[PDB]
Amino acid sequence: GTLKSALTTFQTANTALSKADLFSATSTTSSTTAFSATTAGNAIAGKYTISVTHLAQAQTLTTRTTRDDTKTAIATSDSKLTIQQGGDKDPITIDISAANSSLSGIRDAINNAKAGVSASIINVGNGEYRLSVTSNDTGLDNAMTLSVSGDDALQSFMGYDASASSNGMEVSVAAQNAQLTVNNVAIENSSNTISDALENITLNLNDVTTGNQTLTITQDTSKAQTAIKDWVNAYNSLIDTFSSDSTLRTIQTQLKSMLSNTVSSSSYKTLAQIGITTDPSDGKLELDADKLTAALKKDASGVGALIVGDGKKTGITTTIGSNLTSWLSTTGIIKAATD
Amino acid sequence: LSAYGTLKSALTTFQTANTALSKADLFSATSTTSSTTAFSATTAGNAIAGKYTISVTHLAQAQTLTTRTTRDDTKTAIATSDSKLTIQQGGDKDPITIDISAANSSLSGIRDAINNAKAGVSASIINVGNGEYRLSVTSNDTGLDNAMTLSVSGDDALQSFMGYDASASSNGMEVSVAAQNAQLTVNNVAIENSSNTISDALENITLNLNDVTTGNQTLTITQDTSKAQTAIKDWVNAYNSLIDTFSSLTKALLGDSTLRTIQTQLKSMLSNTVSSSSYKTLAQIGITTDPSDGKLELDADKLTAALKKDASGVGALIVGDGKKTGITTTIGSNLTSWLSTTGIIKAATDGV
């Protein structure tokens, strides 16, 4: 009964260690506050020269004219506002009844539509109000076209079409794309949070750069070490709980066997080889931090192949994980020795 | 009887945590950051996230009028007749009239008279040196619209000393500080305002102006789930405490119908949850339930994800429409009803 806790606490440590990304880990450093970057697994280590000439912006349209209040209907007829963003996006049509044709009503109407833009009212002073509509996301492709059918007055007040001769709205903020170069390669992007340009890298743009600036990606084993230390300690605690029945015996024996009888596609085929040694009397593992760091420094990915493997069928944490789930399941050996 | 008093506290303590969680604004929360000491900003619920480019060319000023001439003391009456001072601010504000009797016609008396009137201005006396005194009158609030007109009827000497009317040929007072409005642009939109604490211009944002800006400056509003997470942690912990109190009373009031009803109902409510959003159960936003004693386990990591993805959606589950729908809503109703004078817990304790 009390050895369900021991096993679940260990299960957690084991899940934490069963992440391939630990073994491709890299950290980052930037020479400017102008940008920063986080990496995921399998990022390529090196100095990246970065230049940033333009930041991405989100379009914001604003009524050219003002109004004496927010309660009074602009339109004397029912009408349909149609918002059309760019980039192969379907248009959204919103009904605006006459009575809901006030700045308040238009605002709420737009916002409740969940159409990828946001509407809000600006009090510009002297009891005068402007409607303002901004695209939720930055980039040329998210710029808007607004049109109204039904009421000429509303259309005349709110409409925007770049190609049109006269527009009721004014471009307050121009939609624009981020424009950078990374290792002398021109990149354009919708967003200042660029995660689809460079592989396994999220690049965060904050300001235009000046001069020669660099993002550095370096190998990082610290994360994988912590995971391995916590795992070793969690297992050693589980063995203490055993010390403190055939169902217990089966779990204790199987876990011992699994850690003893390992298979691996890398050069590292046993725990010892990567620092961790197995005390013959108890079963409990004793990590050597020096010899572990070495193995990781030499071939981090190779260590990963032992600990994680393919994640589905192979790898220590994989097979232990499968066994723990099965023991802790409703049909498992533990739920039967409960009943 | 003592046991029932304890239960009430445990239920009331949980009621508090539940009230605290039942605020929609938690799920639209945003924090702010400014590139200059020149201005700062707090937000309320439902502020729109983004980079705001702000420019500030003028700050709001409050008009200050000052007597053009001085006086040899503060005790000696200026007027030899009773008179009425009338202060008229701008902006569709009603005028205020103040009686000033002759004997109270001294700088002291005029000052006290004005200040006790609570007429939206403040009077004070300035000793400018060499035993010479000036009266000074300033509008309590900044902006063009709070600028003053002062007039006195009754004594020509007082009027001649104190009066101010912009349109007049000769005035007794002098404009020491000109009333002016705050003048800024926010994302290339010209905004004028009475105050340097601007909360009526941009929606759900209070903008605090400190100084004129120089160069390109920005106010940044970013989503903030931290406040909602704290609320949800406290709630989970309060409930888990309540269950401990049930157990303490169960293994004392072993089988009280009234305790059993409350324990069973709370369990059901949290189990059979429903929502307008995609998050239809507490488990989907990262809260798991111990199948035996009913306690809640919170996975902070998993909750932060769900909030980062669709904060408003999580809000729909926890808070709902606030009247009829939402976990905290229906728990709140139940708690009120149990803790009310016609409720079951008094019904139990009265019995004793």
Added chain:
Amino acid sequence: LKSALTTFQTANTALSKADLFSATSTTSSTTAFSATTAGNAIAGKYTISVTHLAQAQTLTTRTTRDDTKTAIATSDSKLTIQQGGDKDPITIDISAANSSLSGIRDAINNAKAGVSASIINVGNGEYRLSVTSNDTGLDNAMTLSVSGDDALQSFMGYDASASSNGMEVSVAAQNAQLTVNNVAIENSSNTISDALENITLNLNDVTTGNQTLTITQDTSKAQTAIKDWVNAYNSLIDTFSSLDSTLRTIQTQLKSMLSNTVSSSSYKTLAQIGITTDPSDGKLELDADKLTAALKKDASGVGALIVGDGKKTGITTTIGSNLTSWLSTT
């Protein structure tokens, strides 16, 4: 009994200060000046400029002397120091033997005549007497005259209007000169508390550019006073419980006074400012939020309830009178 009433009396005295309910703090944009406020200061941004600081006159002998021990005068004499500004003159006897720089110095300084004398060794075994006004400003500038010995007069005397003076003006008396919200102010001192109402303005240096002193409302002080008072009273009730006709009278009267409150303002009970009276014991419960609100809204109005006119009206006023009377010898 006595401890539990005197400890509460202290908390009550501390709360019975009107200034708590008019408090203001300050902030300055420069080290060039700073300001403290007392009660009833007017909140706002004050634009300050400072073009000249106040100086204190310092006169110094034009000639030097070979030592400090040797008498300058061969006759008994009277030094008369006359500051400006409607100040009475001070006359000091200087006997011949005490006519040395040492003697003149001590003579002046012991006279406590609003100036200070000192001897300056300017080098090469040569000494000058120097006399400075204790306070800054044009009005504290000096006139020095001696009657009795022509040599001493010739060495020490100063009169602006005079053709030849023995003393020299080392530092000119001058007034502080500032503007506060575009109003020219002149002052004797760099600690200016008589110009602007309820404000002490401390001048440190000449300003440059546009600078400001800001006065803002401050309720924190009043809250602390009210919390300490509530806690002191709750402790007194614990002492009653722990412990009669004399005790009963004090316990009943205090309860009544807090229950049966008067006021000039819109706050007529403790409830309205978020102090609720516990029926079961008499104890005050303190909601810190509701109190802060009431103070933010109308601090002066709360003050009217708690302090009143200070003499006859106000909670702390009437409690204070009762406590004094109970703790008195009669």
Added chain:
Amino acid sequence: KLSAYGTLKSALTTFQTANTALSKADLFSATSTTSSTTAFSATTAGNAIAGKYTISVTHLAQAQTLTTRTTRDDTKTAIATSDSKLTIQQGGDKDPITIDISAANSSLSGIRDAINNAKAGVSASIINVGNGEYRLSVTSNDTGLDNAMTLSVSGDDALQSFMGYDASASSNGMEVSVAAQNAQLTVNNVAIENSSNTISDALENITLNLNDVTTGNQTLTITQDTSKAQTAIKDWVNAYNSLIDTFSSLTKYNGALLGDSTLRTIQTQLKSMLSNTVSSSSYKTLAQIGITTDPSDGKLELDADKLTAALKKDASGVGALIVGDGKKTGITTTIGSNLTSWLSTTGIIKAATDGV
């Protein structure tokens, strides 16, 4: 008694550790470093030559990066309509690597995975340059002229035309995004070129870390560092003194080994060794380097001042006494041999423990 014998082993082993730590020649050639610029920094190993080194850095080492001149509408669609072989040829006497690229795997994804799984000393990646346009980019894993690439494809003219790079060629599909360059510096007016910005094969026993181009006159300073050797010597003295405490404890009358020949032999031998030292240098004795010996319990008193002096004067000479040739001569050498022999399975502690 088994336990009495057990404490002795722990004691002797604790001292053995301190002795092993002291038995490193490098301690007595230790040097620290200091740089006048963030532009570079340096660590030293044993036997580095002390002095001011003037350093100039005119170019940093770079790794070549080639990038397709043209873009593609997606990453899934095969470029080549025939099976082909990509051959990557780095410079510097490196064998070429050939990779099979089947038509179906001829997409930017496939070419990328193909290159990266080949483990050919370069790395491939895809760059989305915007507007749904993709470029392949290939960078050498290591910096320097010698690691620059030549790419060629045989089999599909389209692929070759799209991906190939040969500096000597008239038309190339790839473009040089970053030029391979060697690090270029001078150290005390001597021109040095290098593949890497972590230079450990140019100057002896020094690893020079280049961070940026220098400006003006900059210097790296190497200084003697006796601190490391002093700590080692303090720990060793303290460990031995503790061992003597354990002897005393184990024999007074905790006490069970009073009389034991095996303890007596170890105590006597160690005392003799430290008393009867020999050395190829001026320093023939522990007393000469600051360590005296109480003549009744044999504990050693370290005078830290005197030691620092002796080290400052002739660090290598002290080293001769403590470490010697490391095999046959030196205090720590002969003690180390004795400890190994006493703690071995055929040694004299086991024989006595077996005996119990």
Added chain:
Amino acid sequence: LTTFQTANTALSKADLFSATSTTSSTTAFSATTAGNAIAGKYTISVTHLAQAQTLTTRTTRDDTKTAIATSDSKLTIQQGGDKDPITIDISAANSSLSGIRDAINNAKAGVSASIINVGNGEYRLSVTSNDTGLDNAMTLSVSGDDALQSFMGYDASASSNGMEVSVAAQNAQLTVNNVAIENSSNTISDALENITLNLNDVTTGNQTLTITQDTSKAQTAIKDWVNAYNSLIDTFSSLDSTLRTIQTQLKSMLSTAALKKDASGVGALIVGDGKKTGITTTIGSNLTSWLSTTGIIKA
């Protein structure tokens, strides 16, 4: 009683009630004050620092052991400023740079001698006045050996000197509130009353030294005294006609605003004339008498 006696002695210093602190606008100078300094802004200017004269042989020597003089001789060092001359015997055998150096230094004549190895096995004698200022500049003369005189002698007025002026003696030169002051030292405590002025560098622009009243010191003293006495009463309570007498007598004897208003006046109460009058004075006398060998404590 002894712990309280300490606190009482600490409070019985008149200077506490005339105390002043200082503040300078520059690292170029700083100042400490003693009792009775005059409060105010002092405008200070510093145009020259004080320097100490240093004379150095114009010629060098091949070593430090070899006698310069072939005859016994007398070195006479004469500083300025109404100072008596010092004569030092230098025997021939002690006529080496070593011997002259030791000879001078052991004389304790207000200068210091040392030997400078200027390179290439060449040595110069150097003599510097221990204190800065024009008045401490030297005259050196030798009678007995023409060679030594010719090598070592210095006289400003002389046509040819063996020594050279390496560092010129100069006086500190400043103005304090537009009053020219000259001084021997850069630690000036004899110019302005109750003020020690420390010169560090020449000033530039308008600088100021500010002296302000410091009641803080007196307050601390008074707080510590009150606390020490209150502790003594606790010790009485925790505890004979001897204790009773001390407790009763101390009681009888005793039976920021005030300091800001009239610090000196407060001082009159606490300290008085220091000999016969003042609280701390009479308590101090009683404590000494109780704690003495003949007192009410010993018996």
Added chain:
Amino acid sequence: KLSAYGTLKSALTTFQTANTALSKADLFSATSTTSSTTAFSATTAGNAIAGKYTISVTHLAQAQTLTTRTTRDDTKTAIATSDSKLTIQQGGDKDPITIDISAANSSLSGIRDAINNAKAGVSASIINVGNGEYRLSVTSNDTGLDNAMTLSVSGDDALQSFMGYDASASSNGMEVSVAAQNAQLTVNNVAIENSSNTISDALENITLNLNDVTTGNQTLTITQDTSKAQTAIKDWVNAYNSLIDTFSSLTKTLRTIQTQLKSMLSNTVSSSSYKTLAQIGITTDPSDGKLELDADKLTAALKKDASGVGALIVGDGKKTGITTTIGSNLTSWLSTTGIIKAATD
């Protein structure tokens, strides 16, 4: 009573240490330093002269470094086909050092090791200048004109042609990479030239450390420092007071030591104006004999005449001085023939 005699030695040795520490004349001539630039710094020893020193530094000292003009394809392959003798001759009246270099050891490796094991006041090393090309480099271990080298080889013309350096020679195999030069400074307007940038032989009792060329007017300041002497005196007083506690612990041979130490501190004499230990602030208790140190008065006496205090405490170091005679007595009591070694038997 075996362990009893052990403690009586145990406390006497601890006191002996404190007494040795106090018996250093330099304590009473101490000075600290302060520099206006990172360009130089200075430490002082005993008897430095206090004052402002104006220092200027126009040139730093350098150590010669010679480097082969030509390179080699590896470090293993012999340059010379015959046995030869390398002779290193530094300047300044230094004897030459000759090193045997056999043909098989004629490689850059071998020449390097050969030079370095010779301990000839230079250091050899190999520089990989790139592209698998190696240069030998030889640098003088100390800076200055006088430590510049002449290299010559007899035996093999090829080696000579590759490695030799002689300033006066027409053609040399080595090149001057760094020129030997002298430090050049002025200290209080006195020109000083020196071999080293760690100058301890120029100015008396001062070690001057040169780091960089100076600009503008800079100064080194030497000021009196009594703090070191005070610490020594406090530690000594405390050590003696501990010893008296150990005597008490053993009373409440010993008698002789306790009485003698008391007498020695009581009947004090000196060459200085100071004779008695009370004169300098260390007063005594007429109960047990302990010393009560009054830190204020000690500092005063040291500030007034540090050297004079030193005369009392240290004296001539051989025959006279408190610490001197106490030291002699302690050594004699703790010796193999003494009082403490004899009682135990």
